[PDB]
Design a protein around this ligand. Structure first.
Ligand SMILES: COc1ccc(S(=O)(=O)N(CC(F)(F)F)c2cnc(N(CC(=O)O)S(=O)(=O)c3ccc(OC)cc3)c3ccccc23)cc1
Ligand code: NA
Length: 286
């Protein structure tokens, strides 16, 4: 009870510092302490009641700086603190948590299109390199299922990807899985009831409203109901058995639309609006 959807950073004309939290119970938005540095193309995650803001970029009017930063938010203190930075800057990053460890997956540093992956141990405040992905992936979506980390879609420096791969932390190795039916970079990727969902993204021509679900048993991707709005660089999370997608770019506009997926009825509904339209946010629930 009383867990909130947090949204951190994002982009509208420049990278933003906002940290806001939505309560799906009462439909209320909280305005919380700003990030110390503006960030878009970051990822959000929660470990032991703390929210982490990982990687991304400060896209200023001045210019662009890719971020290696890891910053920790305590909802009890409403304060951001720096943590150990990653080995490399990672903009358009994917993250997932396994057993209280943060995995920072691919992303970019200028022309560098990362295949590398690194793991954070909060108790030691250190990062270590682990096995690299079999593909370079920026704009990659990450999901954790059955204690395996999945990396889905992205861009390899030449090709936009429908490919996906699976990381085995005990073995420290990656394996290609069944590809998506759609090429998707900047997709929202999340886990709901033992399925991976990949919602929206960009196929190289258009922003997508399509949604595919991965079934681990049959190892296949199937389409479910599409979103009302085409969106890439969207935020995504799961709250009480439902998927929330936040913002993104629809090909013309930076969206403020929050849609909600009910797996029971296979329908999307608009549930609220962010206070302002933005893409490339980091989202998590605690
Ligand atoms: C021009 O039309 C497109 C084309 C592909 C995409 S994307 O969603 O596939 N893609 C992934 C990839 F790297 F693979 F190309 C991404 C592109 N840009 C991001 N941002 C930061 C950045 O430019 O570095 S963003 O949210 O601040 C942003 C900023 C401006 C914008 O105006 C077009 C759209 C977005 C990304 C941030 C997170 C994830 C992927 C990002 C988006 C828009
Ligand atoms: Na994810």
């Amino acid at each position: 009870v009383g867990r909130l959807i947090y949204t951190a950073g994002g982009y509208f004309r420049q990278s933003l510092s906002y940290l806001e939290a939505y309560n799906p119970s009462d439909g209320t938005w909280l305005r919380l302490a700003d990030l110390q540095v503006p960030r878009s193309g970051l990822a959000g995650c929660v470990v032991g009641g703390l929210l982490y803001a990982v990687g991304g970029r400060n896209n200023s009017p001045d210019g662009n700086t890719d971020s290696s930063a890891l910053d920790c938010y305590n909802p009890m203190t409403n304060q951001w603190s720096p943590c150990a930075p990653m080995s490399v800057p990672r903009n358009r990053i994917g993250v997932g948590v396994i057993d209280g460890h943060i995995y920072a997956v691919g992303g970019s540093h200028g022309c560098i299109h990362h295949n590398s992956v690194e793991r954070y141990e909060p108790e030691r405040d250190e990062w270590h390199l682990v096995a690299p992905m079999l593909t370079r992936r920026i704009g990659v979506g990450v999901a954790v299922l059955n204690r395996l980390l999945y990396a889905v879609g992205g861009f390899d420096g030449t090709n936009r990807l429908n490919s996906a791969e699976c990381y085995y932390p005990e073995r420290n190795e990656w394996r290609m899985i069944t590809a998506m039916n759609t090429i998707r970079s900047g997709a929202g990727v999340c886990v709901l009831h033992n399925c991976i969902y990949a919602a929206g993204g960009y196929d190289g021509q258009d922003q997508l409203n399509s949604v595919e679900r991965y079934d681990v048993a049959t190892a296949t991707w199937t389409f479910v109901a599409p979103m009302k709005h085409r969106r890439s660089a969207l935020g995504i999370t799961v709250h009480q058995g439902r998927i929330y997608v936040l913002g993104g770019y629809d090909g013309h506009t930076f969206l403020d639309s929050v849609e909600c997926y009910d797996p029971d009825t296979d329908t999307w509904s608009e549930v609220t609006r962010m206070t302002s339209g933005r893409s490339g946010v980091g989202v998590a629930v605690t």
